[PDB]
Amino acid sequence: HRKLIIDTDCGGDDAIAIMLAMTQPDVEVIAITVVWGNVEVNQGMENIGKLLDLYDADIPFFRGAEGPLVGERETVQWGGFGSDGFGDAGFPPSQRVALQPKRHAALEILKILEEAEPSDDVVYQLVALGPLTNVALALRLNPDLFSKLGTDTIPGIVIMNGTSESKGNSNMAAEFNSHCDPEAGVVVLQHKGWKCPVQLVNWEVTVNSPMTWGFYDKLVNRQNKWQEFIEKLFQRLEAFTRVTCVVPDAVAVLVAIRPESVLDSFLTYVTVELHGRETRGATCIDWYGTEQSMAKKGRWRNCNVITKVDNEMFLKALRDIVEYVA
Amino acid sequence: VHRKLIIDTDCGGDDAIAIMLAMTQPDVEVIAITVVWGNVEVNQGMENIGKLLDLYDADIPFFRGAEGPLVGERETVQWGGFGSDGFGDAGFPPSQRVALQPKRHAALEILKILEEAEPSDDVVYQLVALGPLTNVALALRLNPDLFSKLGTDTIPGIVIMNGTSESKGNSNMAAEFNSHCDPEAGVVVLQHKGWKCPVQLVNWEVTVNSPMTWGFYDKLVNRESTPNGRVAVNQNKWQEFIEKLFQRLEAFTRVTCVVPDAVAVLVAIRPESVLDSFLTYVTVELHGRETRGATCIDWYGTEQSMAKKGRWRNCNVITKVDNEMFLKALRDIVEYVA
Amino acid sequence: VHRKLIIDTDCGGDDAIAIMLAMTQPDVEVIAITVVWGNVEVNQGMENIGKLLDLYDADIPFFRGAEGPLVGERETVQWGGFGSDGFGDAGFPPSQRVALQPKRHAALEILKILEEAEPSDDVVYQLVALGPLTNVALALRLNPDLFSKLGTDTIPGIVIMNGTSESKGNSNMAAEFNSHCDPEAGVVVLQHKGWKCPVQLVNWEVTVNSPMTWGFYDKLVNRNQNKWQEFIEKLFQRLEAFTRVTCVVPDAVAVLVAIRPESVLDSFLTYVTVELHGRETRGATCIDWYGTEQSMAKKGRWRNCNVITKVDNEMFLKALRDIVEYVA
Amino acid sequence: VHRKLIIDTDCGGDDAIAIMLAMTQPDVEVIAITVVWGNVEVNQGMENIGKLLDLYDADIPFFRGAEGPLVGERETVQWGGFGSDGFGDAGFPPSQRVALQPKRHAALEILKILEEAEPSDDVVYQLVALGPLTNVALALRLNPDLFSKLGTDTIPGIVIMNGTSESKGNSNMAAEFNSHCDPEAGVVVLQHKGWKCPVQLVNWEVTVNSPMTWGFYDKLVNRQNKWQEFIEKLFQRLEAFTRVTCVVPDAVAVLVAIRPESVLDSFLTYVTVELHGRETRGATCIDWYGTEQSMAKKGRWRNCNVITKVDNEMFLKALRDIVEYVA
Ligand SMILES: [Ca+2]
Ligand SMILES: [Ca+2]
Ligand SMILES: [Ca+2]
Ligand SMILES: [Ca+2]
């Protein structure tokens, strides 16, 4: 049984990803932590509330950082999902928002880790679907508790972050979440004491595991109440971009909870550039480094670069979202 | 007007003189000491603060903070001017106070103090930072709103010993130690929205400009001679401690002795000691090769040019401190009766 | 179309194969070889070119160029894959051609050749750069206008073995050797206004994707030799001992792209530049994958560079095969 | 000692006063003027030098140099303090000298001059740089060895108006214009091995500390002769824009080159230019506390004399000498 903390900036693919986690057996989302990114934290809170209304779930969700770990944001809000990142769909506003605790998301990660009881029946995982600010902030406050995540075998942290080929979608080199907070990425990747290397679910690997617009049409039944919500959520994205639809965060959640969906990967040293002009936020990957090269430069195999996900397993998981009975 | 201070510190020789100055001034109360990495490691820092509070018998609580920069490995080296422990290698008796202290991270303690703070016309809270800004930045990103509880519209909420005014760097060619230790933290502090008063930047050059003479020092610690020659004759426990604390620094460098952190504490509690300053936009360079940690100052920026760049006057660069008031405050340390 | 090539080079093992390729292809004539620092120092490079031209008894002139980057000390290290002289440590007889060469800096020679050139659609001049771009940048800064004499509206004037398309850096984590050697020079080349055709970027990954097999190599070198095969066996002997299923010969791929444009099976035309200021990414190749006409105009960007993504391996092997079968 | 100067310039208002100072001093001869981009474009610059030489009837040759930085697009803006042409928008008659000038790029002219230079104890050669260092850097990478012909063991071969001593940047927060214009070029000049004497750095703050008064200026232009009339016209926009003191930085640099006794204070140490900072690109980095052992450990040496005080009295007298010149 997996217990997940999902850290998110609450866009359309974040919603599909959360839906995937909540409709999979032997998985329980125990907290949702909101971070700035594609929409502002206040709007994010509203989005999560609307998504949890749909499920009637009593999962607690928390306000996190409104900007980067260090300095003004150097990225722009995309707007691909619409002005609220959620379809501008007219969902009824949620009464869940005001009920939520005041605790900063970072302090909540720590509280959950503190209260966590790892055994072989119950494993805890953090999946990060937005800029890493909340996670970095928690890490520098109490680094030790992060060893409670994962197993020697099961990854404690999976992140939707960076590139494997520096096809940047934010600047020329850097992926959005990474570019949003490069400092936070360094803190996550440099951290000592993960039980398993960070799993890097990067842009290119999600591009190569998309859904077809044809598949989408069938998903949304071109109706039970889940398909209706997905149609409304994706309506702006659909008008703006529609042969394939890339749903990155959902790929990340799939990697976390079905590790067999990883068909190919490369375990090596990875870090984030902080200081370049065109390359701030770039993912730097030691492709050729030997154990002897790394020792010399104080590197180590800290990151598993995911290079191929099983598309078939992904589609089935999406299919499972719309067939879910509580 | 009573001041309640939080002092964030990396626990070197000049940090000790600064805390001594805060603790011996009337209408001032140090309510918490938060320890940060810098010239000594946090563990050693804790031991230093404990030895300093033994001297006073003070029950001020102190807290372990960050062991390294906000982001990445330290890019500075430990100076060693005050000795291997940054505190004289003097054989002070180890303190029993250390083990008694609460486990709380220093950052969470700043937030707790701010949360419990009850500012009024008669009570003002101030944060004086005497080391790398890591703890402060960390507290700031967790709960930025609480920081408006510091200061008044008139009295500065934050005074930092940090940076340069002329980029005479003492860590690399351009950057001062504390700034260079954690440039990212400095950006967080200076870019923060909602300080009641601009950050007061007590920089390297203004502290160099307000030093003590070795001759003054000799009198501070009751060395005399004639007769015959230089020896301490009837030292109080404050002078004895100061003599032991500075003994390595003295052997390494000894006409003037610069005590930067003490100057910053003076600025915080006696604002009339600021003879000259320049209010403008200041930030810290994060990305240069030779200039990482540099203090960048908008010397010629107008209201118009700052508006167009998303700048504002966020920092008061202190350029002259009253040396006479500084010496008197040091004098007041050795004359203190509880 | 008769091609006249200027080959700028740091005179390593793959540089030699590349030059051999140019010199054994019909309707191609190498008219100058300009030497640049890189995997070997300029003096050693001069010696290498001399020994290669001895083999052919070619009277092609060759020139000393920059001994270091456009700006600052080198931030790369000499690889040593081809041996201590970058040329097999093979005991080739030293060349008498070296002392005969003109004193002219390589940069000023590029300018002289461009000045004397009569370009038409029958006779095209092409610069192929196989090393750090120092000499080219330096020439470009001094007389940028003359560089329009290279190429056609159809045929590329400049082809460079440079950069990555995927930031699999072989010098630091992100940057390829030639690019990391001189990132400033790379910006000068890619930012230059007035190329008739975009710069062709023969990057690391595309050359990795078009290698030779060690088996192919054994046949190339006949495994009763001829003089070309003997020289290739000796040139690659250290590389072979150090690394030997596939052998990557990047500079040869670049020369192939310059003289047989039909070997480019796939490419992407967009805006490309080189990072100057990153800590881990100095020398990185920055490629505008998603740039549109609207986004590029706002950013002062334009489609300046053709990123080569697949070369025809079959055409490549045939061209290497043609080296060892050459009769003057 | 007879001095032979090459003056590298971006042709603004203080560049003109500076060149006028060089041309009106005894035992000085300007033998070439090399034009570089900066406050005005090279084409405009050429026009300006031509108008200045018309005034003197001088047959000094001048050359077109770099239109932009050594590497990448300019990251600075044209100031416009001296007006739209950097020269007063004054209506000076256009010069017939421009079309006569050789086509040689300025960089290759520096090399030709150095190649033909004949140093002796009677004749010393100096390069004074009054703009972005692009031309000088470009000449240095092409043929570094020739640059040892400049100077003496005692007399500086290169004097530059460049950088800051206190990082009071007038282009960004940290950097001075010329330095910010071309940081890469500054590294090339400062890192060069083989100068006979350290580079003399005539920086922004020391020139601010040796200005002229507007009152002095009034007396200078006779508030009249052909020299004064020209100076009044050249400074007319600057005067309307800014007018107690008027800073004339390039003139201070020329003064330091030709009257070394005007340097009242300086500090010899290791200096370089930041290439990679966001806010500090173009900053002057100075090793204030470096020692002989500390510098050796880090591959540094004393490559640069940071000028910290110039004799204002000597400066004013030299300006005074401009308007009293008889050929
Ligand atoms: Ca997201
Ligand atoms: Ca301190
Ligand atoms: Ca090569
Ligand atoms: Ca000028």
Ligand number nearest CA of C19 is 3
* Angle (nearest 5°) at CA B313 between B309 and B314: 105
- By the CB criterion, residues less than 5 angstroms from ion ligand 3 are C 10, 12, 15, 130-131, 251
The answer to whether the CB atoms of B191 and A71 lie below 8 A apart is yes
Residue D143's closest CA among D185, D101, D194?
D194
**Of D108, D143, D184, which has the smallest distance from its Cβ to C71's Cβ?**
D184
D227, amino acid identity: W
Strands B315-321 and B274-280: what pairing? Answer: antiparallel
**Rounded Cα gap, residues D130 and D10, in angstroms:** 7
Asked if B48 contacts B36 with a C-beta cutoff of 8 angstroms, the reply is no
Instruction: Quote the tokens at residue C237.
Output: 């002997």
Question: Is A277 close to C275, i.e. CB distance below 8 A?
Answer: yes
Contact D108, C142 (CB under 8 A): yes
CA atoms of A227 and A223, how far apart (whole Å) = 6
Q: Which residues of B touch D169 (CB under 8 A)?
A: 299
Count Cβ atoms within 10 A of the Cβ of residue B300 and give its class: 0-12 exposed, 13-18 middle, 19 or more buried. exposed
Determine the 3-state secondary structure of D305 from DSSP.
strand
D304 — phi, psi (to 5°)?
-155, 130
Pairing status of strand A303-309 against strand A262-268: antiparallel
A129 in a labelled binding site? yes
Angle between helices C313-324 and C13-23 (to 10 degrees): 80
Please tell me the distance between residue A264's alpha carbon and the centre of ligand 1 in angstroms.
Answer: 23
Q: If DSSP states are collapsed to H, E and C, what string results for chain C? A: CEEEEEEEECCCHHHHHHHHHHHCCCCEEEEEEEECCCCCCHHHHHHHHHHHHHHHCCCCCEEECCCCCCCCCCCCCCCCCCCCCCCCCCCCCCCCCCCCCCCCCHHHHHHHHHHHCCCCCCEEEEEEECCCCHHHHHHHHHCHHHHHHCCCCCCCCEEEECCCCCCCCCCCCCCCHHHHHCHHHHHHHHHCCCCCCCEEEECHHHHHCCCEEHHHHHHHCCCCCCHHHHHHHHHHHHHHHHHCCEECCHHHHHHHHHHCHHHEEEEEEECEEECCCCCCCCCCEEECCCCCHHHHHHCCCCCCEEEEEEECHHHHHHHHHHHHCCCC
Annotated resolution, angstroms = 2.5
Class of residue B143 by CB neighbours under 10 A (exposed 0-12, middle 13-18, buried 19+): middle
* D197 touching chain C per CB within 8 A: no
Domains of chain C: 1-328 (3.90.245.10)
Strand partners, B200: B159, B316
How close is the Cα of C183 to the center of ligand 2, in Å? 40
Chain B residues touching residue A275 (CB < 8 angstroms): 286-287
Three-class secondary structure of residue A53 per DSSP: helix
CA neighbor of D4 nearest in space, from D110, D153, D144: D110
Locate the chain B residue with the closest alpha carbon to D164: B166
Put simply, whether C176 touches A (Cβ < 8 Å) is no
Rg of chain C over CA atoms, in angstroms?
A: 18
**Annotated binding residue C15:** yes
CA–CA dist A216, A211 (Å, integer): 7
Q: Min CA distance, C175 vs chain A (Å)? A: 10
Residue B15, annotated as binding a ligand? yes
Residues B262 and B22: their CA atoms lie apart, in Å, by 9
Place of tokens 């050749």: C113
- Chains with 3+ CB–CB pairs under 8 A to A are B, C
Q: Is A172 near chain B, with CB under 8 Å?
A: no
Query: Distance from the CA of A291 to the center of ligand 2, in angstroms?
Result: 39
CA distance A280 to chain C (A): 8
Interface size C-D, in CB pairs within 8 Å, comes to 49
8 Å CB contact of A285 and C168: yes
Question: How near does any CA of chain C get to the CA of D184, in Å?
Answer: 6
Q: Which residues of A touch C169 (CB under 8 A)?
A: 287
Interface check for A166 against chain C (CB to CB < 8 A): the answer is yes
Tell me the C-alpha distance between D303 and D268, whole Å.
Answer: 7
Closest-CA distance, D167 to chain B, in angstroms, reads: 6
The amino acid present at A218, given as its one-letter code, is: K
Angle at B317 between CA B316 and CA B319, to 5 degrees: 130
Could you tell me if C133 and C186 are in contact, meaning their C-beta atoms sit under 8 angstroms apart?
A: yes
Which structure tokens are listed for A220?
């949304």
Place of tokens 């850290």: A7
Amino acid in position A294: M
User: What residues have CB less than 8 Å from C241, skipping those under 6 apart?
Assistant: none
Q: Give the whole-angstrom CA distance, residue B236 versus residue B221.
A: 8
DSSP H helix total and E strand total for chain A:
14, 12
Integer Cα distance of D304 and D319 in angstroms: 27
Torsion, CA D147, CA D151, CA D154, CA D156, rounded to 10: -90
Note whether A296 contacts C: Cβ–Cβ < 8 A: no
Encoded tokens for D34? 């090399």
Rg (CA), chain A: 18
- Chain A residues in contact with B139 (beta carbon < 8 A): none
